[PDB]
A paper describes a structure:
The human respiratory coronavirus SARS-CoV-2 is responsible for causing COVID-19, an acute and often severe respiratory illness characterized by intense inflammatory responses and lung damage. Although the virion contains several structural and non-structural proteins, much attention has been directed towards the S (Spike) protein. This glycoprotein forms a trimeric Spike that interacts with the host cell receptor angiotensin-converting enzyme 2 (ACE2) through a mechanism involving the receptor binding domain (RBD) in an equilibrium between RBD opening and closing. In this study, we worked with the Spike protein’s beta variant (B.1.351), initially identified in South Africa in the summer of 2020.
Numbering used by the authors:
A (entry chain A): 952 to 1148
B (entry chain B): 1001 to 1148
C (entry chain B): 706 to 827, 848 to 951
D (entry chain A): 608 to 620, 641 to 676, 689 to 754
The structure:
Amino acid sequence: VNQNAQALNTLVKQLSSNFGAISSVLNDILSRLDPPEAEVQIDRLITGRLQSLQTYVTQQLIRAAEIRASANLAATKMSECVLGQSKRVDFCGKGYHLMSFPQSAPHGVVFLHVTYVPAQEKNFTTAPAICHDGKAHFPREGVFVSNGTHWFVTQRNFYEPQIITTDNTFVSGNCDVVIGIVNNTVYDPLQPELDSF
Amino acid sequence: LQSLQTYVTQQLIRAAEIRASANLAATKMSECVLGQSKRVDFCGKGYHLMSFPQSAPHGVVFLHVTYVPAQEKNFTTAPAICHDGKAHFPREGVFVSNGTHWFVTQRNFYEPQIITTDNTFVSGNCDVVIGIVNNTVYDPLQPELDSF
Amino acid sequence: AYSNNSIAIPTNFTISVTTEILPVSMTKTSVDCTMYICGDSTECSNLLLQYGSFCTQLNRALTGIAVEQDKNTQEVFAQVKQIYKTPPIKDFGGFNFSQILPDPSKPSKRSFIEDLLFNKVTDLICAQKFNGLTVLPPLLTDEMIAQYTSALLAGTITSGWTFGAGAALQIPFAMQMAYRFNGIGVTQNVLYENQKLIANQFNSAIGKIQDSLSSTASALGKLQDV
Amino acid sequence: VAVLYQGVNCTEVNVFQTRAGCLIGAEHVNNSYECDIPIGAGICASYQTSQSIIAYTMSLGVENSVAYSNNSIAIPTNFTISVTTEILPVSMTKTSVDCTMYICGDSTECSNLLL
């Protein structure tokens, strides 16, 4: 709003500048000097006021390029952040994006974004794989964690400790390849069900 | 004054061009460096992994670590496996064969895996699928129940 | 080839590192209107003041350029307000980052790659200030922009994708590539079994990028054009 | 008020010299804080403590060394839902200017010279 007010204000104030003539008002010049000597002063006044109008049109087209870059960016945030869900980081704002609430504002728009940021952290012990019968086990979703006693499986985004099972891991490779593999016991849920049967 | 006005107008046009390049660099700064972008040919050729910024005069230099596959081999495929009369569709990956036994593997790398109940899923039947092939789906509980 | 029953799956891969050169800001210059006409004379001031506010609008315009040029570097160079440091004991799982990491033994903090980037682009600032074009220095000096880069590198090596979206969470880089392969559709089996081969692929790729920047000086021509 | 000169050392002239130029009326403090009013070449100023304007080196933020180890991992046990604010422009004032009335109105001779 300040660039339009300052642009219109300069655009009006240039009429008060004389631009090399006797006076800025055309009635004092046309009411005194004769028309043939006066036409030279009129051509200097038109050319000066003309240069101010072409200067104004060039600044408006240049400012039109920034308002169009911001408008296309607003349409991009409007598309990704509001209607759907954008997985881009630091696009819809800091944190993992969820939803955006648009709000009307004079000569623009304000976006209220709902983000997910973690708060409390705790140091854990990790291993890339679990060695049980001699063949390796890798996590299907998440990473391996331990509190110093038993190895747990949990997601990277939040802590939900789970017992190592066959559905939480997948069998690939062996124990002599992966660097950092640890030995533990993989729980098989079929065993107590068959013992009870 | 007219020569100076030409200079300032040309500088304003370069200010809009340098703003389009700086905001594009800031966007690539957020998506390529901090996180991981799955967009194709944004962070550079190949599947993007990581981007490393470096200070440079009046700009920035990005080192993009990408995943480009190299060697491949032609294999025989099929959309589904018909076993007991109902179609077995791949959960993750595709069905491949070397001409002897049908294998299950992902599209991004070749890692042979036998057909089990957990790598596929049962949906529909066998007549409605175009290109389905016949094979024997291995049941993991059959030898365990026989040994028990 | 095109067949209904034919498929191709890659049995091997390679890690390529490229370079894209994007200019950020240019040198900020502001030229005074009265001295550009002439100095030490009232004839330039009386006839130039007779044209009104042209100096003021062109001066406020060049000042507006210099402020936005500091703001573009502020939205790009510094993403986070927290400084991250590189630990002295380095075990990355077989990767050698000493080329891309800054060298503390140098008087000014810069990496081995930024040492070549500063040398391949051609005081001149005071020389331009002698003819009446004033070059205002940037708010962020070369050591701090390089410190922003070293902070962002140290965060990617240690914290990974966490510090961009929140507090920095420590993760080992050997497990970090497992998530980066799982995001692109590559099983982490490729990482854990071929990690020794990937270490030689990455170290050779960094050596080839360093050789391309040292042998070919026209790769920085995007900034040389500016 | 702290008066700053641009691209010149101290000539005429709490008179200090920085890379941006001669800075008078401000005090130089070796410690570094969060910036408020920026200047250039890594020096800014703020009003702090009987109070005056102090000049100081750009602080890049809190320096924190994150521990890194092979078997060490940190997973978040709690989360926070934050709302941020993004302001972007959309539209600007629509303006249309007419050549005759803007340059010369109520003038027949000047209106014929414009046509």
